[PDB]
C-alpha cells in the first residue's frame, strides 16, 4: 500500500522554473488521484488520451511528474498542439500526449510585494522544442548575422527573462504552479495502479 | 535574416523589458499619489529616472534599424514611436538650457504671487487666490485688478523666457525635420502609408479652421445673449456692441463660460436636477457609485471591473494622516493592474466623474492586449472623449429615473431643458474659440509669421476678432499673456481639446444612432444597448494600431473631424438663442474697449 508520493510532488516548498522543469519518475506505489482536489479550487484538472473520472481505477507504467510555474494566461499553452513562447521555447506536450495537467494560482506562495524573480522562462532560441525536451542553456541568442561571440550585445540577447511575480498583478500575469502527468495506458507489467 | 525581422526581435525584447520597468514607475507612482511622504517621492523620482533612462537608452538602440527598410506597417508604428530624438537631437549644451526655461516658466506659474494695494504682508497666488476672485467675485475692479496684476507681474517674468523657448523648441523641431514646433505638434495626426486613411499635419489646420466656420453661428449668438446678461449685471462698462472684457468671463482667461450660469440662468425658478439629495436618501457610498457605473458598462457588453480594481483602488479620501493626490485619475499599470484614485464624496458631481474615469479604464483594458507601444488613444483627442461621453448618457433624466435616483413620475420641460443646455455651451462651446485662436497664435509664432514686437498686440488683435473678447487694460510687449495659461507656460498642446470636443459628439451620436435613440441628441442614454457598446469596442481596442481615421470611421462610419454633431447637440439651444437675440445685436465690433 506504498501510496505514490504526490506530496512531494503537489506540495513541495518550490517549484522550478518553466525552462528547467521538474521531472520525477512514479513508480511502484498506489496512485490515489482523489486527494488533489484539497487546493483552493485548483483551476485546471484536464486529461488526455483518457477520463478523469476513471483514473483511479486502472494501471500505467512509466510514470512521470512534471512541474513548473507559469503565468495564467500561458496555461493554455499545456496542451497538445499549442504554440507560443511557453510551448516553443520552455515546454511542449507532443500531439499524442496521454495523460493529466493539471494547475493552480499560486499567489499567495510566488508572489511578492517588491516583485517575485524566483522563476525564470526562455525568450528566444534557435528552432522549437521537440516534446519533453528541456534546454536549460545560457547562451547568447543571435538575433543579428555578425557572431555575438557569447556576449549580450546589439542583436545579441540573453535568453532567459524573469517572471518578476507582483500580487497585485491580474490574473494573467500571476504565478500558476503546473504538474503534467505522464502515463503509458494498459502496458507491460503495471507498476502504478491505485485504487 | 532581414532588418525587419531584427527589429521584430528587437521590439520582442523592449515590449518584455519596458512592462516591468513601466510598472514600477507606475506603481512608485501610485504609492506617493496614494501617501505623500517625502520617501515616496524620492522612490517615485528615482523609478521615473530608471524609466526615463531605459527609454533613451531603447530610443537610441532603435535608431539602428532604418524605417526605410520595414514594410509591416505596426512594426513601423512601433519603431518611429521609439526613435523619436526629441529634444536630444540639439547640443548637450543647448538642451540644457532649454530645460532651465521649461522648469523656470513652471516655477514662476506655480509660485508667482501678487499682493494687493495697500496690503504687502498679504499676497495671492494663482491657486486657490486669484482664481477664486475671477471665478466668485462679481465686483468690476477687483476682478480687473487680480485679471492685471497676474498678467503685469507673473506674464511679463515670463516674457523673454518665453522668446528664448520658441528659438530653442524651432531650432529641435527642425533638426528633426518639422517645419516648426507647431508642425511637430500636429505630428500627432499625421497618418502615412495607408490609403484612403492618410492625414497630413497641415491638413489639421485646414480641417480645425473649416470646422470652426460652422461654430460661428453658434458662439455668436451664445456670445450675443452672454453679453446681453451682462450688461444688465454690469451697465456702465459693458458695450452692446462691442467685445466682452476678459476679466468678466468666469476664471483667469475665459477658456471657459461656466461660472456666468449665475447671471445668465433663461429660467432661474425651475430647479435643476441634483440628484445628489437622492442619493443621500438611499444612504449609497463609494462602493455604490463605481459599482453602478460598473453595472452601466455591463449593460453595453463591456466587461465587469477585475478584481484587483476592487481591492487595488482608492475610492475614498483615506483622511487622518495619510495625505492623498484627491484629482480622479484612472490608473493603468499594465500587467493586469487597472486602478481609479479619487477622492469620492457621495454627490451627484463624482457620480458621474466615475463613470468618465471608468470609461478610461474600458479604454485602457480594451487595448491592453496590443503591443506596450501601442498601448494608447487613436490620437491625443480619443481617450478624453470616451471618458466624455459616459457622463453625457450617465446624466440624462432617463438614465437617472431608470436606477431610481429620480422619480419615475418626473416630467420634463422645455425650460429646464433650455437651461441644461445653456450651461452646457458655456463650457463645451464658449472653450472652442478660445482653443482654436490661442493654437493658432502658437502656431503662427513658431511658424515666424508673428515678429516678437508684435506677439502682444496681434494676440489681442486675434481676441477680439475671433473670441469676440476684448482686454480691459492696454498691454506692450513687456506683457507676455499666453504665457500666464497653464498649457503654454508648461510647454503643452492645446487644440487637443478642440479636437476632442468635436469627437466626443461624433461618436454619441453614432452610438445613440445604434441605440435606436428617438428624439433630440441630449436626452440620449445608451444604456442595455449591446450595439453601440460593440461599436465602441470596435474602436478602443484598436489603441494606437490603426490610424485615427480609421479609428474614427469605426465609431462613426466617416474619416473625418466633423463638427455637425456637436452643432446636433446644441439645436435646441441655437434656435432658443435666436429668438432670444431677435431684438440684440449680434456679432461685435473690434474696436470698442472699456478703457476708451
Ligand atoms: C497538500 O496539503 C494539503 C493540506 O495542506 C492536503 O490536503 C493535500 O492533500 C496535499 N496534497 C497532496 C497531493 O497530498
Ligand atoms: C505611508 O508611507 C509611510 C512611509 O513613508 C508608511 O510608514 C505608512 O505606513 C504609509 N501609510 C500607509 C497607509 O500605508
Ligand atoms: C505584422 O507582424 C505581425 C506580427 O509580427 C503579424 O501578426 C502581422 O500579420 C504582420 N502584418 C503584415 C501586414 O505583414
Ligand atoms: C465578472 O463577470 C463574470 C461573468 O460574466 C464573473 O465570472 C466574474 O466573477 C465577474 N467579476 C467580478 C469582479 O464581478
Ligand atoms: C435596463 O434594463 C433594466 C432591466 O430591468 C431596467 O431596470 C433599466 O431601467 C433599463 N435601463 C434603461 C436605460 O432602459
Ligand atoms: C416650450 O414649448 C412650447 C411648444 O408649444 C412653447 O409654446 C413654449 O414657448 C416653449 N417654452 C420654452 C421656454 O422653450
Ligand atoms: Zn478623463
Redesign the pocket.
Given at each position: 500500500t506504498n501510496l505514490c508520493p504526490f506530496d512531494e510532488v503537489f506540495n513541495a516548498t518550490k517549484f522550478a522554473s518553466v525552462y528547467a522543469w521538474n521531472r520525477k519518475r512514479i513508480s511502484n506505489c498506489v496512485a490515489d488521484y482523489s486527494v488533489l482536489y484539497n487546493l483552493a479550487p485548483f483551476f485546471t484538472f484536464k486529461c488526455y488520451g483518457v477520463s478523469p473520472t476513471k483514473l483511479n481505477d486502472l494501471c500505467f507504467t512509466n510514470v512521470y511528474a512534471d512541474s513548473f510555474v507559469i503565468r495564467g494566461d500561458e496555461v493554455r499553452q499545456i496542451a497538445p498542439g499549442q504554440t507560443g513562447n511557453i510551448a516553443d521555447y520552455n515546454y511542449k506536450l507532443p500531439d499524442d500526449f496521454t495523460g493529466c495537467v493539471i494547475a493552480w494560482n499560486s499567489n499567495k506562495l510566488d508572489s511578492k510585494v517588491s516583485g517575485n524573480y524566483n522563476y525564470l522562462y526562455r525568450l528566444f532560441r534557435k528552432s522549437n522544442l521537440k516534446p519533453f525536451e528541456r534546454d536549460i542553456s545560457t547562451e547568447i541568442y543571435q538575433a543579428g548575422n555578425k557572431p555575438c561571440n557569447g556576449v549580450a550585445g546589439f542583436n545579441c540577447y540573453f535568453p532567459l527573462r524573469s517572471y518578476s511575480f507582483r500580487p497585485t498583478y491580474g490574473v494573467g500575469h500571476q504565478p500558476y504552479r503546473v504538474v503534467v502527468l505522464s502515463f503509458e495506458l494498459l502496458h507491460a507489467p503495471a507498476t502504478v495502479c491505485g485504487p | 535574416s532581414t532588418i525587419e525581422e531584427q527589429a521584430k526581435t528587437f521590439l520582442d525584447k523592449f515590449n518584455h523589458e519596458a512592462e516591468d520597468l513601466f510598472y514600477q514607475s507606475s506603481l512608485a507612482s501610485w504609492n506617493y499619489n496614494t501617501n505623500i511622504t517625502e520617501e515616496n517621492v524620492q522612490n517615485m523620482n528615482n523609478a521615473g529616472d530608471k524609466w526615463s533612462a531605459f527609454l533613451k537608452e531603447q530610443s537610441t538602440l532603435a535608431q539602428m534599424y532604418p524605417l526605410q527598410e520595414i514594410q509591416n506597417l505596426t512594426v513601423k508604428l512601433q519603431l518611429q514611436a521609439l526613435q523619436q530624438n526629441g529634444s536630444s537631437v540639439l547640443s548637450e549644451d543647448k538642451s540644457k538650457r532649454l530645460n532651465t526655461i521649461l522648469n523656470t516658466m513652471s516655477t514662476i506659474y506655480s509660485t508667482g504671487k501678487v499682493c494687493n494695494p495697500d496690503n504687502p504682508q498679504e499676497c495671492l497666488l494663482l491657486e486657490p487666490g486669484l482664481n477664486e476672485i475671477m471665478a466668485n467675485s462679481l465686483d468690476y475692479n477687483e476682478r480687473l485688478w487680480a485679471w492685471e496684476s497676474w498678467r503685469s507681474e507673473v506674464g511679463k517674468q515670463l516674457r523673454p523666457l518665453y522668446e528664448e523657448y520658441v528659438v530653442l523648441k524651432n531650432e529641435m523641431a527642425r533638426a528633426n525635420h518639422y517645419e516648426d514646433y507647431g508642425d511637430y505638434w500636429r505630428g500627432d495626426y499625421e497618418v502615412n502609408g495607408v490609403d484612403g486613411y492618410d492625414y497630413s499635419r497641415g491638413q489639421l489646420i485646414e480641417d480645425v479652421e473649416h470646422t470652426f466656420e460652422e461654430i460661428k453661428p453658434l458662439y455668436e449668438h451664445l456670445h450675443a445673449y452672454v453679453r446681453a446678461k451682462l450688461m444688465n449685471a454690469y451697465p456702465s462698462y459693458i458695450s452692446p456692441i462691442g467685445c466682452l472684457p476678459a476679466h468678466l468671463l468666469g476664471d483667469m482667461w475665459g477658456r471657459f463660460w461656466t461660472n456666468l450660469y449665475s447671471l445668465t440662468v433663461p429660467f432661474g425658478q425651475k430647479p435643476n436636477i441634483d440628484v445628489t439629495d437622492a442619493m443621500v436618501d438611499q444612504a449609497w457610498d463609494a462602493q455604490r457609485i463605481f459599482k453602478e457605473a460598473e453595472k452601466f458598462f455591463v449593460s453595453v457588453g463591456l466587461?465587469?471591473?477585475?478584481?484587483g480594481f476592487?481591492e487595488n483602488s482608492m475610492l475614498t479620501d483615506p483622511g487622518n494622516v495619510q495625505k492623498a493626490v484627491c484629482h480622479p485619475t484612472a490608473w493603468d499599470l499594465g500587467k493586469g493592474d487597472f486602478r481609479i484614485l479619487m477622492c469620492t464624496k457621495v454627490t451627484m458631481d463624482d457620480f458621474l466623474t466615475a463613470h468618465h474615469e471608468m470609461g478610461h479604464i474600458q479604454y485602457d483594458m480594451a487595448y491592453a492586449a496590443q503591443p506596450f507601444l501601442l498601448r494608447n488613444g487613436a490620437n491625443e483627442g480619443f481617450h478624453e472623449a470616451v471618458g466624455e461621453i459616459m457622463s453625457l448618457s450617465a446624466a440624462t433624466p432617463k438614465h437617472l429615473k431608470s436606477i431610481g435616483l429620480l422619480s419615475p413620475d418626473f416630467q420634463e420641460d422645455n425650460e429646464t431643458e433650455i437651461n441644461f443646455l445653456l450651461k452646457q455651451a458655456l463650457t463645451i462651446v464658449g472653450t472652442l474659440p478660445f482653443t482654436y485662436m490661442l493654437e493658432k497664435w502658437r502656431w503662427m509664432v513658431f511658424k515666424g509669421e508673428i515678429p516678437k514686437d508684435q506677439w502682444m498686440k496681434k494676440w489681442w488683435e486675434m481676441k477680439r476678432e475671433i473670441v469676440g473678447v476684448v482686454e480691459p487694460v492696454p498691454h506692450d510687449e513687456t506683457y507676455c499673456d499666453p504665457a500666464s495659461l497653464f498649457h503654454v507656460s508648461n510647454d503643452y498642446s492645446f487644440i487637443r481639446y478642440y479636437t476632442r470636443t468635436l469627437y466626443q459628439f461624433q461618436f454619441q451620436e453614432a452610438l445613440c444612432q445604434a441605440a435606436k435613440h428617438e428624439g433630440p441628441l441630449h436626452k440620449c442614454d445608451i444604456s442595455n444597448s449591446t450595439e453601440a457598446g460593440q461599436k465602441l469596442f470596435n474602436m478602443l481596442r484598436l489603441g494606437k494600431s490603426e490610424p485615427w481615421t480609421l479609428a474614427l470611421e469605426n465609431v462613426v462610419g466617416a474619416k473625418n473631424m466633423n463638427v455637425r454633431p456637436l452643432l446636433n447637440y446644441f439645436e435646441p439651444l441655437f434656435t432658443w438663442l435666436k429668438d432670444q437675440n431677435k431684438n440684440s445685436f449680434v456679432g461685435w465690433s473690434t474696436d470698442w474697449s472699456p478703457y476708451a
Open positions: - | 466587461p465587469n471591473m477585475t478584481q476592487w
